[PDB]
Amino acid sequence: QWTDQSFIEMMTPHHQDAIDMAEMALQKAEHPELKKLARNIIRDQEREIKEMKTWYQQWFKRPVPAAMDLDALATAQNFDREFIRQMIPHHQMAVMMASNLKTNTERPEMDKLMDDIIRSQSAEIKQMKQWYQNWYG
């Protein structure tokens, strides 16, 4: 059961992990589709980290207090395959957390953010699943 506070505390580094992996994709991705996805992840999730940080300090009067395998990704023969393998369940975790917080929060800021996370990351999961089939199925 997430609260606004615990959600931000956990979703911030969770998002940062996705961003870090997407950054690696800018260099190492094989398919242009994956590079485009990576750019979207960086743009959307950096923005959301910024919003969460701003709100956290407003609401709690203090800054946000400080799981994926980048090593495995960097050495994979197929970067895109390993990226998808890790990013799908990572995204699924975000969707799960967001869906729960949506039922717990009273804040319009969080309600809208949850909708964005659920919509965008669900769509990206669908894309990645199809690409995986096309490329490796």
Ligand SMILES: [Ag+]
């Ligand atoms: Ag996240």
Ligand SMILES: [Ag+]
């Ligand atoms: Ag993710």
Ligand SMILES: [Ag+]
């Ligand atoms: Ag979690």
